[PDB]
Amino acid sequence: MTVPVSVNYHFTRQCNYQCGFCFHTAKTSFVLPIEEAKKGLLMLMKAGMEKVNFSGGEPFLHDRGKFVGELVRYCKQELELPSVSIVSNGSLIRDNWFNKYGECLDILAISCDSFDEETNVLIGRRQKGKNHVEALRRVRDMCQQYKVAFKLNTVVNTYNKQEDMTSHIQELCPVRWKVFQCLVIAGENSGEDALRDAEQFLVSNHEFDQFISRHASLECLVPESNEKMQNSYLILDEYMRFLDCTGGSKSPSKSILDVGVDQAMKFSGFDEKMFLKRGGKYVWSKADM
Template sequence: MLVNLIQVLLGLYLCYQVFLIIYRHVPVSVNYHFTRRCNKACGFCFHTATTSHIEDLPRQKAALRLLAEAGMRKINFAGGEPFLYPKVLGAMIDYCKTDLHLESVSIVTNGSLVKESFLRQHAGKLDILAVSCDSFDEPTNIAIGRGSGDQVQKLYQIAEWCRQYGVAFKLNTVVNKLNVGEDMNAHMAALRPFRWKCFQVLIVRGENDSETGTLRNGHKFTISDEEFDAFCERHRGQACLVPEPNRLMAKSYLILDEYLRFLDRTGKQPSRPILEVGVESALESVYWDEDAFVERGGLYEWTKPEGGQDGCGGGEKLDW
């Protein structure tokens, strides 16, 4: 009876969040790409290192407070590679939980710079750690530009640290021409992420759409919708699988960039910095597809799972 009541209350709460997003344009979930710098060179990257700018910590905290006051409930720190700035990242994580009392704080990382000491220090304030891994074949990772020969081993190590320190472990995979035929079922059973996001490789104008005008040319990695669907069908037995085709991904993420501006998801100019014009005015000046955000599952139980985090089920633990 209690479980049923909790499920009903959770459903009502999610419905309320949907109402806030779609009808009041509340930035419930924000992806803050506070740096574009990265130590990897993924060939399809759609948020490339076009600048090395990073705001001072006091300005970042002020912006985070404005977002919280405007209705933000979840913050996701991304890049670039956020762990290039571990002190800044750690300070913002602690601030978001201790001072702003956000429901969920998460990080997306390529995993190469994650240290156990960071998780030990900040695990109490960090809900989700998402690691990007596109293949369990190291030569493929190297060909993509993400690998250095040890990414799979490091991935398993991070998954174990997350279990040890009570952080929900999430996995992100970009499905592309080099990995579309891969079978990852055994690794999902061993890693047991609570959520596995599989993205269809995406082309973004001005970021990865040209051989000469941009830092990356993602066209060489693109796949058809049918190929993406076949990859997802191969892994449909994984309960944690969350497929994200281009039609849902392209305009559904609310992104705050390194200058504290919202990016327009149709390729127009970004907003003015939210510290100058406020969150509401900045949000009104850009396009964000709130319906697609809801459709792709942008609202989910994003706090730390109670009693374990397993989403993909059991399986034999592999020796890495």
């Protein structure tokens, strides 16, 4: 039986940005009552979960960041999880949140696809109406101030495929720099009713390889081609259903809240060998960094 050692919980699909290739789109606004989410996290820890990553959607948009804060505190203080992380666009992370919850967060990943603001506009890394300026640098400084490990995520796509990020990554010094090839998921960023159309963003495997090669000097680089990314995550949706990506979509299992972890896991599509090959198990607790 596969142990769900590291699990992503996309607890909301709502987002304030509009990234054109987004593969986890705003198809619903449902969020579990926080006590139900805590019951799911408890049974995941009982099944062997050691790392949880909160995703979405934008995790800091829900309830002004209080929901993700409380889940981080619950997992660290009540479940004693070795690793608690978040992946965020960074735009809504505030100093008061960090002062309250940062001691419980091991790793904060901020997504940054370009250091060129025209490219970010083309991609949709922007809110409609008002906008923020240097959210990335301000969040990076908060991670140093509150002693959280800083991680950066980048999607290689048509509009950054020639970008040399070396000097910027050198300055930011992330502990881990994930570099994803833009990935198509039917019903998310392809398909008749999809909210996004990734076609204009996709790169060839070779263009992905050339972006990786350009940045091979950076020791923090963790590349994930489509092969390494598609099925190598345990992905719980906003109903705490595992999503199986093996068929090219995000096909949900029943909720662990109804059937338990082991039963739902059979329908996760998780490729544990690929999880290990891409570097999914790593030094992820802050005592060890």
